[PDB]
Design a protein around this ligand. Sequence first.
Ligand code: ATP
Ligand code: ADP
Ligand code: MG
Ligand code: MG
Lengths: 811, 588
Amino acid sequence: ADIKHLLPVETQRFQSISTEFLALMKKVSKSPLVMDVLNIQGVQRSLERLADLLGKIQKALGEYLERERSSFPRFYFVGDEDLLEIIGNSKNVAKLQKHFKKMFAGVSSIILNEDNSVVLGISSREGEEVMFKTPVSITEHPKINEWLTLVEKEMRVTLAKLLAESVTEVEIFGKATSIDPNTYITWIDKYQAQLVVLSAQIAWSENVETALSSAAPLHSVLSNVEVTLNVLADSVLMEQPPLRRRKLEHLITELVHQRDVTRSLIKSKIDNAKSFEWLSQMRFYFDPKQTDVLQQLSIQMANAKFNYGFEYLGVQDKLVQTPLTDRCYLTMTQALEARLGGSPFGPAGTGKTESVKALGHQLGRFVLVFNCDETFDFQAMGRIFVGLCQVGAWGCFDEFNRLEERMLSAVSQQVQCIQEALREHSNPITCELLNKQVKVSPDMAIFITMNPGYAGRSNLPDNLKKLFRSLAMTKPDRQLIAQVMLYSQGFRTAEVLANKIVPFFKLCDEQLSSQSHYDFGLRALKSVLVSAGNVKRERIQKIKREAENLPEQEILIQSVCETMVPKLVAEDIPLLFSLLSDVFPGVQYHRGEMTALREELKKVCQEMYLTYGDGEEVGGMWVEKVLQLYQITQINHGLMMVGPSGSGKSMAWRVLLKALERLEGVEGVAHIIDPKAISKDHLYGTLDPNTREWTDGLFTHVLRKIIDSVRGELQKRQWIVFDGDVDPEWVENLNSVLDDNKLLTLPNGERLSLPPNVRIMFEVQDLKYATLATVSRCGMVWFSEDVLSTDMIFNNFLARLRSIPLDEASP
Amino acid sequence: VSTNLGESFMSIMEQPLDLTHIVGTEVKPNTPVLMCSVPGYDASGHVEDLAAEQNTQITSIAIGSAEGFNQADKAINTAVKSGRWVMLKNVHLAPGWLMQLEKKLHSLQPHACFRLFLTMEINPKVPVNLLRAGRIFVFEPPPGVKANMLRTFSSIPVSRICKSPNERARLYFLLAWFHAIIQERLRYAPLGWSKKYEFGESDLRSACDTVDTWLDDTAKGRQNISPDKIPWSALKTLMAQSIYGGRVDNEFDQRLLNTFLERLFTTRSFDSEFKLACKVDGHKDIQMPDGIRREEFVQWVELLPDTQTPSWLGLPNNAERVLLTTQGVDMISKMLKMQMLETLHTTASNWLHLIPQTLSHLKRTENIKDPLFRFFEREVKMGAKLLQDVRQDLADVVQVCEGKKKQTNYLRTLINELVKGILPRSWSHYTVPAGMTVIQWVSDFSERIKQLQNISLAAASKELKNIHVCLGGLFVPEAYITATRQYVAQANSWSLEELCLEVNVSFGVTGLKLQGATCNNNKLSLSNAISTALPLTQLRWVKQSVVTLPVYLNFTRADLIFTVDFEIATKEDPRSFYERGVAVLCTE
Ligand SMILES: Nc1ncnc2c1ncn2[C@@H]1O[C@H](COP(=O)(O)OP(=O)(O)OP(=O)(O)O)[C@@H](O)[C@H]1O
Ligand SMILES: Nc1ncnc2c1ncn2[C@@H]1O[C@H](COP(=O)(O)OP(=O)(O)O)[C@@H](O)[C@H]1O
Ligand SMILES: [Mg+2]
Ligand SMILES: [Mg+2]
């Protein structure tokens, strides 16, 4: 309201362009034929003038965006363009479904009716739906912020009510030693994954508390957990739907963690619930007599009590509760109790950001992950801090040490102000940020992720170091995470497979040659295990196309070879093969079964004047390298065709893109960006210090075009290659894109999620400057200098001489 | 100095700094209070608590941004006009602003009760003009256990300790003693701690807060607690996993912290005559005071002797010998600098002709399934490549210094590096301890080349298992260990996952050296010697008290290879072994 009072010239321009667009729609509805529409001269100039005036109006109208953000707390997490589209399309409603993923934690879309006037519920990105107990009505015609606040409150209330019903149901399950798998599976299908895991945790915590209130009851609790785990494994061993498979996997992980904790408790002698051997573990308490439905569940630790935020998280991924993860939970919980931010640190790949995210999801809190770089100024930090203060979410600033020491010291003042505000809240509460008083929710948490000594990064000032509780974490429990994840995916010899695959990686990391593009850490192990689960499911499907027993050793070795062989140099292939044969005696190997792709690759290579090989011919190494690249496209996100200049790593991915287009029928679009031909500022985008306006860099503009998909870009296959050398100046801004987050963060605060049809590739030459945080996140495809033999180049030159005449039958 | 100017000439330096009187009387209003701090130590809390005690108001501004500069200017103007205080944090990040800050400080006449506090790290970028302008204060970790506990007790307010129950004073004394020990152990690195952890005042504040919280949880307002009802396990676990164990990387450092906590936080349930440490092995020990009051504990702290050995910390008595000798010769050099105010290429070519006579050549020893053979083959190949590169560079340098060859960019860089005496970045292929000089690096290179020549001659003639290897002469020793494990597993058809290691003093490893211990019939014994040379270490891989010792790659203890297990003697203590920092080194 009152638009005409604030901006008179802007409203005059709006009326002028409205009259022009009324004339345009009149003249286009007068004649529906495209030729008759094109018959009018000056339509291009009219469109150009309309676009220019629209751009000027949008540019000069941006002062109202902050005022709109001030009302609804979640509005701080969207950009200028899409926030303006949300405001303009408030009555459209059905357009806003693509913008909730940035406003909420896991609410990818909302559920409406045919009348488009009531919100039936919310839905995640995986098809999981939450049905509201009392729907919110838009037929009263409220404002957008009003009904968004109502729908958020109703979502929290519905989640709390569903959790209460689920935990009552689990309590009536747990009274019997024997359990019915049909009833268990119906309950799992009835309740969402987060609420199911929460109900299991609450039931186990209450059972252990009653046992310790009082030997025999603790043994009974352990026996019940073991019986439940056996039922879980039996139900996972057969075919399941995808969403139910994920729910069963989460239950398996949490139940095996509970079994380990109960076994640790019963190994020693515990007689009272006040013993620290039980107080140190994560405990859950539910009070059905509590009048407030939001405060029914309390999450506790060592002298630290928390409430559940009841934020919808969809399904996501549940970590394996290793002892290192338990220690991290204890340290971060103590820091949060002391109103201090947490700061885990260590080498990249030890699971710091995911540990913080898992803790935030365990407490049911919204978490935001930022890969902050040198361009995160004081104003940008203050903007995202006031946004977090209003929304009451968590911050998970990744790579905090690369933040321009003077700006780091400046941000320390805002951090200290937040800590003082939270301590005042701990006993209409505000704190001063950016010369403005901002309401601070008690759900605040600021977390810091650091990798000291990475690429000569800056160090924190002491006054900022004193505000964060440090936590060293360097050696994760690889054996435990492998065993739990394999047992969760479903494997009879899961413990044996993990105990064979973890020391194999330990041997392979320190036996092979020292190359700059080698990872053998937790990220590589997790990729291998995920690929093993996927290929095991595919092999089971192929066999059942024609219970039974499957060669799990063969499946694991196939995944290991498929994920680790392409990154090897020609010298390390026999070494890794001998290591595999030594670890697994009856190992064996197989490959191939790609006849259609192979013959289409042959056709495209013959078309584009290349040389082909069947595996042992002159082009065989290049062809199998192309096939390896295809496999890593299938099972990975970030790619890096490493090799010396002249190894065919451009023609390889070009012919692979063309062949994949010919097979799948999906047109392939490739964007080649040189990261060094332009500066980092021009590549990613600039932030104007005078007015906080963000322009688009090359990569950010390409990603925005793909996301918006005006010309149908989601349906195609988009491949972004960075044809240039790599250094941590700019590639460290992509470490969140190549992570589980799959998103890019900009200094203005908006989040750019990555669509599943986009693969980000590199065509680097040497890795003598990139860091382990970058090498770890990508799957290497080492193109050796002997891959492209010289007679292949000779034959290509001869073919191009025989065809394609120079002055482009002919003389 | 004591016998020349009285025994109490330096007595005020051991005492905690009395900032209140110095700020209120000594410092002129137009002179900023410069407060330099060593990295890892912050001095902002001192001024904040001083202003809280004096009931004044301070605008604390974090220097480093343009709006920070504007806020600092506005606050300085307001404080000069009115008479409040202004604090600027981290001013070492803007000398180009510190210069006109100094100029505008001298150009203005301020109010009488106005002080400006500048906090910075000790950096050369601070302007000498501002350093001359202000009153300099340096903030460092306090020297000595006595001064450390004095500073701790001065920092902790009396009203916090004196609250009920009465065991809080003894618990605070134990916490202060623990903090003093583990902060004094940082000086004797890497023996005291394998790294330089930042065990600052924030950890002490968090530990005091958690002690208060757990004591208030246990006691419901009772005047005293039985020593068996104190949450000893809770305090130990929380300070080992959250507060002081947060910065601990290595399992050995975590084991040392656990040993200290479990030794210090039981006191036989507050029993009298509890030995804190062992100052001298011959009839000298440190005893827990029997008092109950904070004043009594402070009086006991002030009654500590001025003498202090590293054995107070659990370290060997000879841990401070090398550092103390270096500090003495540094003092002599400083005095020599004080009283000081009261062709070259021919020699370079002579050195370049002198060095390469220790290096002659290397063979290459190429299709076999033996893991040891392929490991030695790749090691010999890497050594031969390095030797060829080094010899070619030396010949090129000799030619460009005296001969027919011009100087290129790389050759000029190599000339500069060799003249300066530090290692060129090209030659640094294998690990080097903390940047060793080229003089020692050439000798180490010659030793490695000789060892690889011996390996090549043995491989030229199983015939490879019977050789003896120096663990410090290999480019990667973990690869040798894994190759030995793979060899024995493949030979005896075992599983690589179910193999452990046994140490006897069937593979022979030479060059392993102990640190503050001796071996006799495979039984460890504590010794006052710095190091003892193990004659030959035998490694046997089998499928299936005793202490666990690290085997570090060098004297800096920055690289860990593998962990050994040694039988302890019938009279020693594994806790003593862990406290004295007994470790194994492969090179020296
Ligand atoms: N399979 C092949 N058969 C025949 N010729 C080939 C083949 N692959 C590549 N070539 C030839 O090699 C030339 C260079 O290869 P390509 O363009 O793929 O460069 P590249 O290896 O990616 O190098 P750079 O990293 O320097 O860009 C091509 O112009 C082409 O003529
Ligand atoms: N306990 C665990 N359970 C399951 N997965 C884990 C666990 N710890 C680490 N991971 C996986 O290992 C990877 C480590 O990434 P991480 O180190 O968190 O990134 P960053 O270095 O940015 O913090 C993550 O992708 C995570 O999925
Ligand atoms: Mg991270
Ligand atoms: Mg190329």
